[PDB]
Design a protein around this ligand. Structure first.
Ligand SMILES: Nc1ncnc2c1ncn2[C@@H]1O[C@H](COP(=O)(O)OP(=O)(O)OP(=O)(O)O)[C@@H](O)[C@H]1O
Lengths: 107, 107
């Protein structure tokens, strides 16, 4: 589904969007090549090539990384153990943050 | 797994023989990478040089799966003297910042 990728790929430029597709394509072709003692294309299943969502997800998580803005590598470090609701104040703080951001957007 | 960075302070009166104990513990750690940062190799340096040297020593420790580092005679490292008092602020800030920087994930 294109919409998922469009939403998820934030801060990307055109060139990186092309590179993502290229890397995704490479994966199946690699799935069909066995290179252990001599490069040997199969050709017994090369008439069944398909590109699935898992290839896109893996390529997103491993190969291509944008060069602008904040990405997952930062949020991972700063929020190391996540947030746990141990009481009331957490919700109050988050609600105040929501109010402030909404005010900034609208006013 | 939650705490990839721990630290401890050995303290006591003078001539109690503490640096030797730290060296013994480090040697018994059996970690692959062991380094000792001591003022003995920074005589006459300006504070900027000290900052850079400490930064380099620490950076070298981010490229291993297990590391142990020893800081020796902190007071001499800060150039402290009771009169005034008089010390180096820049190095103190460097240390304070550098005791809570987690390494690259998984080390
Ligand atoms: N049980 C022991 N514990 C520690 N050091 C010992 C012990 N037995 C012998 N030694 C020796 O005593 C000396 C201790 O000197 P050391 O430099 O460790 O003291 P220090 O506290 O660092 O000195 P200072 O406080 O004056 O800087 C070393 O030679 C060490 O090998």
């Amino acid at each position: 589904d294109i919409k998922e990728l469009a939403v998820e790929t934030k801060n990307f430029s055109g060139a990186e969007l092309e590179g993502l597709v290229r890397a995704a394509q490479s994966t199946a072709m690699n799935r069909h090549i066995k290179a252990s003692t001599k490069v040997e294309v199969d050709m017994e299943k090369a008439e069944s090539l398909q590109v699935t969502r898992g290839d896109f997800l893996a390529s997103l998580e491993n190969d291509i990384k944008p060069a602008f803005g904040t990405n997952q590598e930062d949020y991972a470090s700063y929020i190391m153990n996540g947030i746990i609701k141990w009481g009331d104040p957490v919700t109050r703080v988050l609600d105040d943050g929501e109010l402030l951001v909404q005010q900034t957007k609208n006013s | 797994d939650r705490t990839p960075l721990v630290s401890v302070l050995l303290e006591g009166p003078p001539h109690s023989g503490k640096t030797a104990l730290a060296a013994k513990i480090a040697e018994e750690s059996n970690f692959p990478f062991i380094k000792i940062c001591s003022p003995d190799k920074m005589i006459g340096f300006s504070e900027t040089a000290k900052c850079q040297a400490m930064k380099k020593i620490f950076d070298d420790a981010y490229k291993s799966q297990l590391s142990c580092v020893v800081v020796d005679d902190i007071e001499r490292l800060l150039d402290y003297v009771p009169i005034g008092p008089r010390f180096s602020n820049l190095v103190l800030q460097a240390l304070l910042v550098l005791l809570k920087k987690a390494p690259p994930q998984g080390r």
